[PDB]
Design a binder for this molecule. Structure first.
Ligand code: SF4
Ligand code: SF4
Ligand code: FES
Ligand code: FES
Lengths: 633, 633
């Protein structure tokens, strides 16, 4: 099972699933081999009913699509549609939060409120919304209206791009025509230009994709902003991760998906029903997190993280998961079928994301508490049905310190330098104690033994004094393998990095270091990493493509991650990816994305399937940035 | 060549292309056989990087996607993305026209203006925009702002749906949650819900697709409305069609694509440069139409139609096409390569639709006349380079009467009944002189011998007294085969239909009948057919799903046509399609689209590849509608 996942709890559940005859994502992957090479290389098009068209990577015909579309056009159109689909997910998430904030401040959903007033006021100031002499409710109404206005064309471009990046970066992007005009406007323009008989020039197509990736960045940043207003900005928290966080004697309830608009309410209400859970034979309600909704409630409330991404079915296989409460994105629809065998109640909550065979509860903000109680009572019923059944919860978990929002990181640094908090971090970059910064982001992917790339790359970078930050299922991989436990700083970190983590932690009263990797939150919270490095760029007076900062989507899968990787390149970062997207069928497109885009944005993709080689390539990229600043390396 | 196209001019050019070694769409189709059966059946998914996934239609594994997505989910997600892409094209077209109208009435593009004041005022009244005491420029500004507001969520739903359909139809759709909230909002929601780990219930997915198809209908109707304001509502015109409209001694200039925002200007300016063309050895500038931009200028100015859709390369093969001026949609990118062999200057004009190897001229409304002159002068240069070269223009053309906007049809009927113009048409439906109405719409498709389905079906329906209306490349097929020549009424039409066409034509002073088929314009002008049958429904006091009205997308290809076919079903029409979309891999999805959707909208798809059978099925559908009204059949 170690060829399937490097997580020992996951291996144990894979053995249970095998002896019980329950098919897993890994079994369905094996059943798909050999996968289609036209699709793997990108040389397939279904954009009209004259198709499907394909192109042989090498050899004889077919050499061109029926309409005349070349390999370069077919590959670029497919990639653009992936970016648009990712943008549509992150911005659908943000849009829902904008509507929730509007409802809350109009008096229409009393379960929601302005929890972070300081964040509200700073966002308003960032956007140019007046604060002086205005009620908080009116300021928030203005912020929500601004959020919704960024989805369509108006007199200004998308402010959740233009107000969040360094001004020199906005100027470079504007010169290339890359600033989005409206989030949904760009998504639709991608769908139009990639339809049959439309854009047929690879460079033109890819420039559009870069612009649409910035629409995705805007949705990410808007989602983080709005979730912080509504639910609180994260601050450092201590919790646990992996399947051992489930409790045989408790009602185990997983929140799963991405938008925490209901799961934050699930967390609050579950506490109020401890007595009702005790009447039914449980110690209480044990809410646990899967995927990014789990990251949201871990970051804000220290809810323990059960599992992530590719291994999500394994939580059910324990027999102890009484309910799995779904919103949208990254939910394997197999969970609805597996629930019959495991007894778990799978509940969908969003009108646009239903799964056949799952129970649906129509969540509405105005009725959020009622909804959480109806849902949680289905879970309590389920816990009672499994009275006196054996469960197999692997006794495996790690300690996790998390909650490193950008505000929290700046605050931690301020204990070393109150009036210039970024300076101690920059001081240590310049002197070599910190070699650079790497963001790990994105999913797991069944093609890669689970977590193998994240942990192999992270280990090498930490030994070379790289400050490592992580989001999404990259943070999930690292937390499940101990990278967020400060007890592992001695083992994992080079002496320079250890010195800095210790100095910061000791100034924060911890008597011990910050953890080896800083968890910055969910996938939308990749925007927090942008805010951090944008602040660093502005303090140094340079653009992001001169900083020793790189990213690695080491095991990526989702269209959302393709969008994130593309905006990382667009804002100027060397961006490693550990699974090839469907681009190898076009050498011209591959050359743009890995080389010549440098001349446009200063970023570039680094394609490397071997994680040891990937770490060497990321260190090389960091060290070239150091050299361009005149720093030793 | 008659297996490739039923058009004799196209056959002649296929022989020339073969002896000159020029590859055509038909050659590229042959080179693609056998096409992938997974893609043909819809059983392929590439929505994440764990793919590509496929499902065997029958037999052993693979049976399910890697994430657990079933065949039903995979097929429904793919179809939904096709509908969203079509909506993005039609509404991108409409959005561009909305911006053009706004620029014109703000004094920013003097080459554009309010040409149809009556249409402006009726659209304003339809939307609830006040007209009394307002300048036309301010009314138009309000209409343009309303058009742009329908792209995003607001306090009202999409008004270019809710104000254009019968109220009972709006109520049925609203009860099922099918009214779009915003055009680009729906496109993005489709992209989100169909991304990995999101919507996984076929019925839920398909309901979303029906809603997004109504966003497409809104874009079509908005595009027709705005183009009529800016360029004039069509009225009956007489012109010609087929390759014989090219002239060896003239500068032959094709306008090709969909948005006539520049080609209408091309038509005006070309007249002003007749003298400049005469200096270079030509008789003048002969502007001809390809595809829907050609339909737009045919409908408004009687510009002759050169060719359409699948056969567009053949116009170049004559050797006499000096320039082909492109905007977007349905342009085979092969034209840029074929131009090297034929001498044609291929010019792109829109930033989001470029073709490698074509010359680009950045069109801007503010500089429209300058742009048309720069473009037309490239064409005059090209005509001079082919001095003393042999050209092979097939001496083949038909007479075309066209320009039947809904306003023109109502006006023609008003000569029989001034105060109740629809009554004479209804009178003849009730008495059997008109059996019903069929709209032919959509593309040609290389899988079908060109025009064979349109003409075979139309011939049978006309003999059975069906009033036939046509748009897009369905109108192109019928015009090229004589169906728009009133001299063919005796041959083609049953006695009842002939009586009505003659009575209407004689009351309109023609001394002769209306043509056998009424050309209602471009693909967006399918909205005109909606306006006509909506008016008929309102006059009879019933909904569209009780009228003897059907549609046939007999040779369809583009994602835009998939969207149109889907909204035809959604508004209540039996809708024949002559090429199977990628749905046969899921029996549950096929059953929804061909049967059970009747219980939702009253419309349904009729899947029939055999055009003689299709005509029988369409007549059966018409006759069942007649029976439901108590009419003889
Ligand atoms: S758009 Fe072109 S390449 Fe794609 S399926 Fe249609 S004919 Fe084939
Ligand atoms: S979304 Fe599911 S079915 Fe589609 S490629 Fe990804 S794993 Fe395969
Ligand atoms: S031929 Fe396999 S992905 Fe299309
Ligand atoms: S396997 Fe051929 S279309 Fe994907």
């Amino acid at each position: 099972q170690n060829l399937k996942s490097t997580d020992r709890a996951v291996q144990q559940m894979l053995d249970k699933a095998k002896r019980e005859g329950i098919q897993t994502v890994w079994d369905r992957y094996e059943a798909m081999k050999p996968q289609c090479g036209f699709g793997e290389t990108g040389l397939c098009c279904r954009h009209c009913l004259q198709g499907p068209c394909r192109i042989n990577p090498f050899g004889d015909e077919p050499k061109v699509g029926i309409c005349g579309a070349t390999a370069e056009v077919i590959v670029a159109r497919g990639l653009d549609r992936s970016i648009a689909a990712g943008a549509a997910g992150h911005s659908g998430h943000a849009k829902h939060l904008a509507h929730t904030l509007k409802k809350a401040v109009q008096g229409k959903a009393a379960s929601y409120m302005i929890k972070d007033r300081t964040k509200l006021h700073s966002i308003a100031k960032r956007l140019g919304i007046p604060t002086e002499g205005q009620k908080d409710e009116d300021i928030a109404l203005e912020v929500a209206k601004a959020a919704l206005a960024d989805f369509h064309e108006k007199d200004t471009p998308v402010l959740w791009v233009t107000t969040v990046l360094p001004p020199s970066r906005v100027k470079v992007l504007s010169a290339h025509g890359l600033i989005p005009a409206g989030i949904d406007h760009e998504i639709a323009e991608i769908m139009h230009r990639t339809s049959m008989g439309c854009d047929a020039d690879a460079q033109n197509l890819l420039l559009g994709g870069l612009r649409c990736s910035l629409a995705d960045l805007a949705g990410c940043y808007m989602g983080t902003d709005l979730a912080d207003i509504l639910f609180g900005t994260p601050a450092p928290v201590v919790t646990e991760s992996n399947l051992g966080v489930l409790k045989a004697d408790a009602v185990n309830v997983a929140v799963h998906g991405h938008n925490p608009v209901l799961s934050d309410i699930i967390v609050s209400v579950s506490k109020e029903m401890e007595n009702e859970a005790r009447a039914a034979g449980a110690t209480g309600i044990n809410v646990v997190g899967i995927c990014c909704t789990g990251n949201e409630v871990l970051m804000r409330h220290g809810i323990p993280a059960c599992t992530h991404s590719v291994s999500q079915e394994m939580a059910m296989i324990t027999g102890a998961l009484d309910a799995m409460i779904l919103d949208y994105q990254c939910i394997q629809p197999s969970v609805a079928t597996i629930a019959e065998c495991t007894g778990t109640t799978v509940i969908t909550t969003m009108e646009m994301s239903k799964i056949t065979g799952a129970t649906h509860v129509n969540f509405a903000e105005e009725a959020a508490v009622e909804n959480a109680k109806q849902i949680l009572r289905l879970a309590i019923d389920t816990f009672k049905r499994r009275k006196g059944k054996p469960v197999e919860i692997p006794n495996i978990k790690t300690k996790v310190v998390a909650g490193f929002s950008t505000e929290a990181i700046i605050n931690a640094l301020s204990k070393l330098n109150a009036n210039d908090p970024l300076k101690p971090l920059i001081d240590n970059v310049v002197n070599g104690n910190i070699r650079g910064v790497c963001l790990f982001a994105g999913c797991n992917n069944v093609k890669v033994p689970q977590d193998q790339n994240f942990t192999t790359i992270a280990r090498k970078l930490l030994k070379q004094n790289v400050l490592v930050v992580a989001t999404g299922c990259g943070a999930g991989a690292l937390m499940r393998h101990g990278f967020m436990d400060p007890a592992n700083v001695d083992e994992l970190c080079g002496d320079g990095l250890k010195a800095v983590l210790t100095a910061i932690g000791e100034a924060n009263g911890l008597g011990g270091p910050l953890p080896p990797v800083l968890h910055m939150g969910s996938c939308v919270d990749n925007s927090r990493a942008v805010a951090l490095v944008a602040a660093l760029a502005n303090r140094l007076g340079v653009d992001l493509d001169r900083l020793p900062v790189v990213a690695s989507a080491a095991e990526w899968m989702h269209e959302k991650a393709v969008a994130i990787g593309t905006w990382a390149v667009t804002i100027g970062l060397p961006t490693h990816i550990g699974v090839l997207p469907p681009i190898t069928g076009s050498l011209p497109v591959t050359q743009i994305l890995t080389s010549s885009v440098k001349d446009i944005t200063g970023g570039y993709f680094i394609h490397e399937l071997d994680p040891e080689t990937a770490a060497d390539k990321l260190l090389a990229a960091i060290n070239e940035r150091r050299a361009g600043l005149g720093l030793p390396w």
